[PDB]
Design a protein around this ligand. Structure first.
Ligand SMILES: COc1cccc2[nH]c(C(=O)N[C@@H](CC(C)C)C(=O)N[C@@H](C[C@@H]3CCNC3=O)C(=O)COP(=O)(O)O)cc12
Ligand SMILES: COc1cccc2[nH]c(C(=O)N[C@@H](CC(C)C)C(=O)N[C@@H](C[C@@H]3CCNC3=O)C(=O)COP(=O)(O)O)cc12
Lengths: 290, 281
């Protein structure tokens, strides 16, 4: 069982470099439009009216695309180009929910650099790996050749976690695209994902945390809230149904295991090679892989 | 620090499926040759497909445990590429594939016992591992087998197994594994780069003395090639390799003491010196 990203090729063929003045970052080229963070032009609406199409330099590899129009949508700039991208996959723009996962394609100067999986934290940050020049890198999921784009990268907080927008330019979380030190809300642990990962552990032969006890949902939620875990809902219990079906361990049975781990710790033991309780795998992530 | 795979697009363009009889696995289509595990078994006995499009086989040969199928079409998506044989401790990206269709990408490290900690199901054989340097893909792994302990084993692209395994339907055991010393050292350099340097001491060691101590803690001995690849990190931090070795020796002999390095009480041994520079630079 491994943290596994989607194959990134359908997205690599869409990455370009956008330059305006002395600022450069990455853009996403779909059909005849390039999407990139509006920070590349740095009130912002007045800054944009003062630019012309020729102020924007867009490169796909070494080929310069010609900008024939421009607009702003929240924190995202949309550059119309006179060339359509033939590598454009079937795609959608989606706004993901906290606790869901996606693949990030880290890019620099329009060149894809690395790929890895992230979860949208409850406090709407992501624990990524991004350096100077990564702005405009995107996050996505792939379902049957359709790429659903959900994240465009903008900033790194003082704590080292990351913040960005959806592809409509609206931030996840209470952040803004300005050069300021910004703190996130208090983070919490994605309970449904921890349980999905414990099921993944049982499917892979790790069973030392299982116990004889069962708990009620409300009693589990009282302990979970005490340890800064998100509440578990009946919908979460349902979503875990297939994993409980495959393992023969009722969901509220697994919750009793989680409660004991939270109250007694792991005593130096590991689960799937981890000394910590992992909450960045969704129930679907476990199913899709196992 | 994240375990980061290389972008997989250059390899995705090369994945095909190879069927002989009822057995289908993945193949790697470079120029006019398709490489796949020989376990898949005349030219017309082989069904090679890119998606649902058949590629006509015009020749075949066997190189160790890999089958080489000559096809009549040169792959237009062929990247600049090399076949390389990696050493234990080196990392690479795996593109997990089923029936010629890529499924996911993740980073693996070759253990000293020549296994990797993969995520592979039935139908994954022929999936490859690779590194990408300046648009050139160095292929280093082709997947063949899951051991009874859940770890995985395979060959290079010349069909030679890493480790003492064979492509038979038989339960095989790896040697007892050890910790990848060169990678732990890279991880300590990464901690120093980020300001976490409590573990630096004022001792040094010889390479040989360190190696003999290391083996008593189930750590790998260092080669001269290991000392060489730590050079860039040593210069960046101004900490000599043998001085860092002396620091690691104290951690082995004295423990963390409820202290952390880069947030964890466990030392990490699956980031190479190149991986550390990749992520810090
Ligand atoms: C006082 O200020 C601060 C204080 C404390 C913490 C702070 N953090 C940020 C920040 O993150 N600022 C954004 C720009 C604003 C306008 C949204 C930025 O720097 N984003 C990077 C990606 C970043 C770069 C390092 N790791 C990444 O993920 C781009 O890629 C674009 O900038 P570049 O042109 O490439 O350098 C400012 C700041
Ligand atoms: C009694 O014998 C055993 C006992 C105990 C443990 C054992 N392990 C193996 C083994 O590993 N067998 C090879 C085939 C040989 C010729 C190398 C295999 O590799 N199976 C998969 C990949 C595997 C399957 C699940 N996860 C993977 O990684 C392929 O992809 C090709 O086989 P398929 O045609 O796709 O099923 C045999 C065996």
């Amino acid at each position: 069982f491994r943290k596994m990203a989607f194959p990134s090729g359908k997205v690599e063929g869409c990455m370009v470099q956008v330059t305006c003045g002395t600022t450069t970052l990455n853009g996403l080229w779909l059909d005849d439009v390039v999407y990139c963070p509006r920070h590349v032009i740095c009130n912002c609406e007045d800054l944009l009216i003062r630019k012309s199409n020729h102020n924007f330099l867009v490169q796909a590899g070494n080929v310069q695309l010609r900008v024939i129009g421009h607009s702003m949508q929240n924190c995202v700039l949309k550059l119309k180009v006179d060339t359509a991208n033939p590598k454009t996959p079937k795609y959608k723009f989606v706004r993901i929910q906290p606790g869901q996962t996606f693949s990030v394609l880290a890019c620099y100067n329009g060149s894809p650099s690395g790929v890895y999986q992230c979860a949208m934290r409850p406090n709407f940050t992501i624990k990524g790996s991004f350096l100077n020049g990564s702005c405009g890198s995107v996050g996505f999921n792939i379902d049957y050749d359709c790429v659903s784009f959900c994240y465009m990268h903008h900033m790194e907080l003082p704590t080292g976690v990351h913040a960005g927008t959806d592809l409509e330019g609206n931030f996840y979380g209470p952040f803004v695209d300005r050069q300021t030190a910004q703190a996130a809300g208090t983070d919490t642990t994605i309970t449904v994902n921890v349980l999905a990962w414990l099921y993944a552990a049982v499917i892979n032969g790790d069973r030392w945390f299982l116990n004889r006890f069962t708990t009620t949902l409300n009693d589990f939620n009282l302990v979970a809230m005490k340890y800064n875990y998100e509440p578990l809902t009946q919908d979460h219990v349902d979503i875990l149904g297939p994993l409980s079906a495959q393992t023969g361990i009722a969901v509220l049975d697994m919750c009793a295991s989680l409660k004991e781990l939270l109250q007694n710790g792991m005593n130096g033991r590991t689960i799937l090679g981890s000394a910590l309780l992992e909450d960045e795998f969704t129930p679907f992530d476990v199913v899709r892989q196992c």
